[PDB]
Amino acid sequence: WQTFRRLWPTIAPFKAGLIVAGIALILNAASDTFMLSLLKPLLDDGFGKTDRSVLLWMPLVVIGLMILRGITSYISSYCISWVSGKVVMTMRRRLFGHMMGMPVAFFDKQSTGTLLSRITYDSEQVASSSSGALITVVREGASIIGLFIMMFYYSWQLSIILVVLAPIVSIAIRVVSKRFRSISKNMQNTMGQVTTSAEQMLKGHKEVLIFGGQEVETKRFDKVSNKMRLQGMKMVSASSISDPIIQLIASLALAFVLYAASFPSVMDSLTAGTITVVFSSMIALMRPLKSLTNVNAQFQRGMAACQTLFAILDSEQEKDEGKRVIDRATGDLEFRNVTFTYPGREVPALRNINLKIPAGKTVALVGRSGSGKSTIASLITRFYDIDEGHILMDGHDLREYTLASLRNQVALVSQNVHLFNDTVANNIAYARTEEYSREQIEEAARMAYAMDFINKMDNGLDTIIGENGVLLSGGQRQRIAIARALLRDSPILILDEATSALDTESERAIQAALDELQKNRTSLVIAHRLSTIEQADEIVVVEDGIIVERGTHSELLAQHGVYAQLHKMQFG
Amino acid sequence: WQTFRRLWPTIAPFKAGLIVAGIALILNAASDTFMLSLLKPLLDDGFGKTDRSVLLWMPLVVIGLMILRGITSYISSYCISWVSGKVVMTMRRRLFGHMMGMPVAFFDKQSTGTLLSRITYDSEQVASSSSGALITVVREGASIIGLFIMMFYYSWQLSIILVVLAPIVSIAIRVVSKRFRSISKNMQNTMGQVTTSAEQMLKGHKEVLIFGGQEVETKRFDKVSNKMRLQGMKMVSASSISDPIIQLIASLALAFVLYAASFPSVMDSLTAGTITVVFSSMIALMRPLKSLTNVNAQFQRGMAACQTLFAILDSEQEKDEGKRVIDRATGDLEFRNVTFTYPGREVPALRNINLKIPAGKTVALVGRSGSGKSTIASLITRFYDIDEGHILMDGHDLREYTLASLRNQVALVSQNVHLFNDTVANNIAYARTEEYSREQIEEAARMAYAMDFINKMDNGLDTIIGENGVLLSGGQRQRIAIARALLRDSPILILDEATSALDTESERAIQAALDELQKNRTSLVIAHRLSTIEQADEIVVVEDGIIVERGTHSELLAQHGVYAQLHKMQFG
Numbered sequence A, B: 001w002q003t004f005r006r007l008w009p010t011i012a013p014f015k016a017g018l019i020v021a022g023i024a025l026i027l028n029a030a031s032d033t034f035m036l037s038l039l040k041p042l043l044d045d046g047f048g049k050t051d052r053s054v055l056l057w058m059p060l061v062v063i064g065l066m067i068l069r070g071i072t073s074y075i076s077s078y079c080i081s082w083v084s085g086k087v088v089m090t091m092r093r094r095l096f097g098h099m100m101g102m103p104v105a106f107f108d109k110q111s112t113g114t115l116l117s118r119i120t121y122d123s124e125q126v127a128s129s130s131s132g133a134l135i136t137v138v139r140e141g142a143s144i145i146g147l148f149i150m151m152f153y154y155s156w157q158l159s160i161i162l163v164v165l166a167p168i169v170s171i172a173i174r175v176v177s178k179r180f181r182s183i184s185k186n187m188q189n190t191m192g193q194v195t196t197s198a199e200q201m202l203k204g205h206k207e208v209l210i211f212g213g214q215e216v217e218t219k220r221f222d223k224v225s226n227k228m229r230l231q232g233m234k235m236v237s238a239s240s241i242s243d244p245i246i247q248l249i250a251s252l253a254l255a256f257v258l259y260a261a262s263f264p265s266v267m268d269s270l271t272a273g274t275i276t277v278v279f280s281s282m283i284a285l286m287r288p289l290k291s292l293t294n295v296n297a298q299f300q301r302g303m304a305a306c307q308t309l310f311a312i313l314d315s316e317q318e319k320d321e322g323k324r325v326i327d328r329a330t331g332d333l334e335f336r337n338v339t340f341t342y343p344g345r346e347v348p349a350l351r352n353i354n355l356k357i358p359a360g361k362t363v364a365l366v367g368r369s370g371s372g373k374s375t376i377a378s379l380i381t382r383f384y385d386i387d388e389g390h391i392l393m394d395g396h397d398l399r400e401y402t403l404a405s406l407r408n409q410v411a412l413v414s415q416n417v418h419l420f421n422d423t424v425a426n427n428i429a430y431a432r433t434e435e436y437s438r439e440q441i442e443e444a445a446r447m448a449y450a451m452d453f454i455n456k457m458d459n460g461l462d463t464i465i466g467e468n469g470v471l472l473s474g475g476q477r478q479r480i481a482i483a484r485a486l487l488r489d490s491p492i493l494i495l496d497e498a499t500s501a502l503d504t505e506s507e508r509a510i511q512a513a514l515d516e517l518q519k520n521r522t523s524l525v526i527a528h529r530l531s532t533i534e535q536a537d538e539i540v541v542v543e544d545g546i547i548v549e550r551g552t553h554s555e556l557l558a559q560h561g562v563y564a565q566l567h568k569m570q571f572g
């Protein structure tokens, strides 16, 4: 029940395997009563049954076994492997999704590696536990149930020995079990870190070469790798001494039987009938119990694992939700005295900031490399659901709106763009339906000045791109990121320094293209190369987390207030 | 021997565990002969030995067992878990390193996820195999050796049955074994892909939200996850039917004994002495063999795994090597008619390109967003060890030089910069020795216009940065990447569009800083914002994979050849 219990819910839909495998167990039990009912007799009494028994019962061994034994063995493996494989893969399925249901700074804090690990490794653990362990915890479990209810009344004297050591083996084992849950848990995170250190290794290849520390890396790894072999070794050894100690408690109630057989049987009451069955039943029961211990380890490993990720899944959906779902979008972006800071208790990266970007209009964000530009940029699309103030899209605040469509009401080109490992078409197509017309993309790639090189590379939009635009120019990439963002075609379009690395001529080319389209929609462009703002409906000069000037390329320039300054630095 | 064999080398240094665990096995065997030499007698003959036997031999059961049994159980677990834990973690250790010993487009082609996976998952497999399997393949293995040499001469008649089914069970099993090696192998890659799809998930979070396809992702995952539960299930079921089929061959030679016991024993020669021991020995031998099968599975899983990564490690060190190791570096970069293309058979991204950058001089790379700029940039530091031509640092070609110091002869600021998850200090410090003076960095961060914001954020250089500069501005990051690259202080410095996203004023600030330092060293700056080139010792205008103009801001401008064009587009 309880934690264990809370896991049965996800196993429930798969219980058909549990039962079918338990029924397979039973049938092999029957196959044993018959295999005993032929093997021992033809043993010594062999030349005593050499005719009728011998001959006529040979084809019943091959059939008794093949049929029952064989088909039942494959009934067990059959339904057991199945019940686990599904609960495991269905487990990791549930996390994956929950993971991305973790909006915000979650992904900011911990290394992606630890998360990645959780899916892979943690799920696998809880898997083995559910299947093979439930089968034996109920098998050797029911074996212990029969032997204790047997010695119970059948020999109330020796059962007064079981009621002195049963609670002692049970308590000593409950404890070793908690250190099992724990040692495995830590064993997990460790495995997780092995991952992280491995990701960095690869992700940072370029660096690591000129870096001048490939070995500094080797070192970091050896330390983590090792902390793994020893993390686990820690548990395995803890489990090894765990067995012989329980043998002690077993060999204790059993030796107690020998002490009461020297005096109490020499007082009858035990005789050669009970000093045979109560003792044989003792030396027997200690075996299935001293097996349930060795497998308990594995059951814990997984159980503990369940609870780790049971919890990670029980975490909080950083995806707060509103209600109002809109399909239309006149991009009437508006937000007042919105103040903002990142992980809670620190110093605001954006103070009392008021601003309105009416539909069709183009508002720009320029300021010192460090003012909340990119911040507010991403803050529009709720990535941080605010600090204190009001941000509303058409009179309605982001919250009033459903995160879902809200984010469907905007296209973006993040300062540094991230891409996938598909085809050009796709990296653009993976932009809402993931399947539009070959036209839209053809067009988008063109109205993004890129159809020329797309076509230069064989396979065109069908060409495989570098994992995160690795096998091609950043400009090319950026353009493509602009492509994607342009094709989607939203009412509110944010281009966070979308020019970043561009052939000046090519740049201005897009600029023209932009003007042509953005002429209707609401556009919020935030770049540094002023050249692409001189003709914006309004420019928001912002420094040190706070806005300082709203004006036309003209007003600003004339005003000589830090914008002008930058427009001076413009050249020289 | 062979593949299996080739793995023993890495297990060798750990064989002390193998032997100590085998000696522990033996000792438990002796503990069994004595446990039989007390348990059966006190069984029925209990009230027949109720005094001397009973009493005086009880403390020898508790000691016989505790001592031998207990200490031997912990001797087995002890040395076995150890031998594996080391061979596994030492395995993944060897790959990790080899992995980064894979210079070039390796990391370009396949998803980092697959590699990451290999370490984690593949190593674990070969681990279990080595330990638990070698123990039982030699245990149940030697058990089969004794039973076959026994029935051998002891009953040459029934041994003429073993020499009819032994080769049949052996061949049927050798085959199931190959499908074990295979099904596990594919099972691996699958697990690998589960990883990749999971990485993308997280890495692409930002996207995936505005993306508008969180569920498209869910779908991709379910398909891979599932392909996993079924990949493995495929093997497990294949193993399940594998057992009952071998039971068939066993139940075959055994039933043959019953057929020759009805007529041949009824011809003596077998009688009730041999129709008891040869048959008992038969029904016995089929058990340890029908166990070696079930564990063989696990042994294969790992064996196959060894060979997968045995090979991945046996791959080619894309790190070709030279000989000449230099410590000094007057940055005399020089290279003629060097042509270059990427993955072999395609169209050159750099043609006959000749260029010399003499020590102290500053050569710039500008051209259309698509010309081999970043390419040659990275080509200097050998990342692609060339196509056809000559690139030499001080008369000596890159090859003549040792990759090692060669890359130590240069500092770089890649178009898009990659960072780690340490402290500011470190992301800069991880730049050769990984431990310099607090000054150098203080200075580097300053002479990189960044000490101001570094100090604005609490903990300063001791502050924890975002996994790959996530929790701070790209400008800030870029500057830091410049920091790192600046502190190292090399003779040849390449700044690939190092300004990318910078506060114009801040930009020019660095520019000044650059001039001050680069005044002595050899500097190759390749940007787009021309403003930071107007005063370069020479500007290399390059378009469509080929150079087209070498001249001063002046000559070029005056010449009116595509450079001027760009310098016109400069504004407007």
Ligand SMILES: Nc1ncnc2c1ncn2[C@@H]1O[C@H](COP(=O)(O)OP(=O)(O)NP(=O)(O)O)[C@@H](O)[C@H]1O
Binding pocket: A108, A342, A343, A349, A368, A369, A370, A371, A372, A373, A374, A375, A376, A415, A545, B457, B470, B471, B472, B473, B474, B475, B476, B501, B502, B503
């Ligand atoms: N995750 C974070 N945690 C704390 N502070 C942050 C975080 N992200 C950004 N900041 C702060 O916000 C500013 C950087 O972000 P932002 O203002 O969005 O950059 P940006 O406008 O793109 N600047 P730049 O890239 O230099 O043009 C600085 O004041 C940072 O200290």
Ligand SMILES: Nc1ncnc2c1ncn2[C@@H]1O[C@H](COP(=O)(O)OP(=O)(O)NP(=O)(O)O)[C@@H](O)[C@H]1O
Binding pocket: A457, A470, A471, A472, A473, A474, A475, A476, A501, A502, A503, B108, B342, B343, B349, B368, B369, B370, B371, B372, B373, B374, B375, B376, B415
């Ligand atoms: N790994 C690669 N495999 C194949 N082609 C590549 C690869 N990397 C770059 N290219 C080609 O080389 C050019 C892009 O690289 P490069 O010329 O270095 O960019 P760049 O000069 O930095 N351009 P930009 O970033 O736009 O200023 C294009 O013609 C690409 O198709």
